[PDB]
């Protein structure tokens, strides 16, 4: 068939390896991994032959692909004549999360069998220790293949002293997957969140780090369980600020407050704002309402649709991928309008936005919690959040503007089902428990908790995981992880179209929410299907939303657990107590608390920010 561009090819990769054309082999491997990255794990459009038995068996074909690719990478990286360049190593660190899955979704688990070929010390105390010859080539190959699922010992202080850039690059790579759930991967990331911030702080630029996964580092620390998990963000901001200044940046001087139609100007900088996205559903009504106090200028990408653009008085596209040009365009927009407020409803999904948060454009700079975590930025004054979603204020470096619980009325998805079907089983022989969670939300604590519920419950249970982001070569690994805790008592469903996803959940008798990072959309889905479930609460907003939303929707407090032991007890109770469970489901079906999420007075955000501006003006005399 005709296509836009030649597909990356396993055959061409293998051929280059055979010919010891190392440059062409590296190029083909990077092209394969980059295309997988583009398609979020899907391997369509990567060329390979396979036995005809696998034509209709997608999971088996994916494992075959991962196995074949693992074999080829083994042949290449074990070759002592293969010399990896520094720019080569940098490109591999950016896609290490995909390398991980090539091994982790194969039967091999990891690339440790390659690492073992690099050991030069026959007198080692442990097979888990790898001693390298003192050349940068073997150190880089070691580090590139030190994967999340590796069982090899690595002492970070040792690596740091040997080569800071390689050490830092590996630490980025190990933070960057969207599934860091296994004991081995979660343990590495855990250790990094404690050890790495004081080291990362020492970098002055991002030039020798894998820059393209910086925003993943920024976002992903929120899925760890440590109280101080967001510390790496403070460190990353310092590096970003330094990097920005070393590119010649100068902060805007605030000398005037511009007016348009007699109102001060709010510039809104958007990461995702298509009307099909959550952030539009959660945050658009309060922006529209703020036009009563401010003139709103929205800056977003080409992909924003008309409904998205229309929330603003005027809208401008960000032309291209260059971050300096974006900040320059934003700077000129704030200068031209003498902007009063800079608002970012989400920060973290784009590196450009993180740069923005580390510079001065307007006297009041504000985020909302599209990604629910503190910035640790010195340049962000305020966070907009619903009062009932806040746990501890100490989780944020910013000052929280705690709005009324109805101040951000949601807009319903247009894909919302209109003729929901209900299965209310009176006395099921097996209680089917649905878990709607992106892979980022899975971790050993959560899985161990489910295992305990299974082992202690006096009813039989089966866990159905509806796994957002478990796509293509991600899936076997995630499935094996689940199996390692729950055996035959769980089913791992790949990321699916919305209707399939709702079919999976609707056949469950109850749901359980992940922790520490809970759900929002998944709770909406739950009550849409007339289901009930248990959640865990805690101090972060991303821990506490579930509690607030359950209360908004009229679910009772016993379903909201403080400790892990509490969660276990409440989950068992909901599973065992068939009549109690069905009564709550009848409450939810009849009450339709969902409709109340779409109502509220949206004016507080505008009014609160206007009051803050007033106070700023009379403090500063501008
Ligand atoms: O197999 C699947 C899994 C999920 N979904 C859909 O995806 C929704 C869940 O959204 P995501 O997959 O993006 O997961 P989250 O709800 O955790 O994500 C949302 O909340 C985040 C903050 O935690 C960010 O704001 C993110 O961009 C936003 O989508 C579900 O309600 C459903 O509509 C499917 O259709 N099929």
Numbering used by the authors: 0 to 621
Give the authors' words.
Soluble HMW1C-like N-glycosyltransferases (NGTs) catalyze the glycosylation of Asn residues in proteins, a process fundamental for bacterial autoaggregation, adhesion and pathogenicity. In contrast, NGTs are two-domain enzymes that consists of an N-terminal all-α domain (AAD) and a C-terminal catalytic domain that adopts a GT-B fold, as shown for Actinobacillus pleuropneumoniae NGT (ApNGT). We focused on AaNGT, an inverting GT that catalyzes the transfer of Glc from UDP-Glc to Asn residues in the consensus sequence Asn-X-Ser/Thr. The heart-shaped structure of AaNGT, either complexed to UDP-Gal/UDP-2F-Glc or UDP-peptide, shows the N-terminal AAD domain and C-terminal GT-B fold catalytic domain, which is composed of an N- and C-Rossman fold subdomains.
